[PDB]
From a paper:
The fungal Bromodomain and Extra‐Terminal (BET) protein [name] is a potential antifungal target against invasive fungal infections. One attractive target is the fungal BET protein [name], a global transcriptional regulator. We show that [name] is essential in C. glabrata, and that inactivation of both [name] BDs induces lethality.
We adapted our HTRF assay to perform a high‐throughput (HT) screen of small molecule inhibitors selective for CgBdf1 BDs over human BET BDs. We repurchased and rescreened these compounds and subsequently tested the 12 most potent hits against CgBD1 and CgBD2 and the corresponding human Brd4 BDs. To better understand the different selectivities of these compounds, we determined BD co‐crystal structures for the non‐selective tetrahydropyridoindole 29 and the CgBD1‐selective methylpyrazole 63. The structure of 29 bound to CgBD2 shows that the compound's acetyl group forms direct and water‐mediated H bonds with Asn386 and Tyr343 in the BC and ZA loops, respectively, while the morpholinylphenyl moiety packs against Tyr327 in its gauche− conformation.
Author numbering: 301 to 416
Write the structure that this text describes.
Amino acid sequence: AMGQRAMKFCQGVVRELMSKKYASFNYPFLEPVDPVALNCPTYFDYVKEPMDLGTVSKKLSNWEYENLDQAEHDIRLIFQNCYAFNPDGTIVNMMGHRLEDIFNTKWADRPLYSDV
Ligand SMILES: CC(=O)N1CCc2[nH]c3ccc(C(=O)Nc4ccc(N5CCOCC5)cc4)cc3c2C1
C-alpha cells in the first residue's frame, strides 16, 4: 500500500540501523530473540509481540506496511520489548536505548507527504 518514497525511506532507516556502523550496540536486535539460546527462558512471560530489525526489514520488503506509522510502530515495538524485559542498567537495555536515540534522530527526517 505504501508509495515508493516512504517505503524507500523506511528501508533506508532500517538498513542503516542494521549497518556495520552500529554493530557495537545493535547486534542483539538484528534477529528474533531466542529465549533458550540466550539463557533467558522467561522472555515470553514479559513480551507478547516479538519484533526485531530484520523482521521489520523483511516486512518492508514484502510491502506489508500500509504507512510510516505502522512501520514506526513495529520499530518502536523492538525497543518497548527491550525495556520490558531487560531491567535498568543491563547492557542490552542500554544498547536498546542507544539504538532508539539513533532511530529518533533518523526518523525526525521522515517524509511528511506522499502522492500517487
Ligand atoms: C533483544 C533482547 O531483549 N534480548 C534479551 C537478553 C539478551 N541477552 C543477550 C546476550 C547475547 C546476545 C547476542 O550475543 N546476540 C548476537 C546476535 C547476533 C550476533 N552475530 C551473528 C550475525 O551477525 C553478526 C554477529 C552475535 C550476537 C543477545 C542477547 C539478548 C537479547
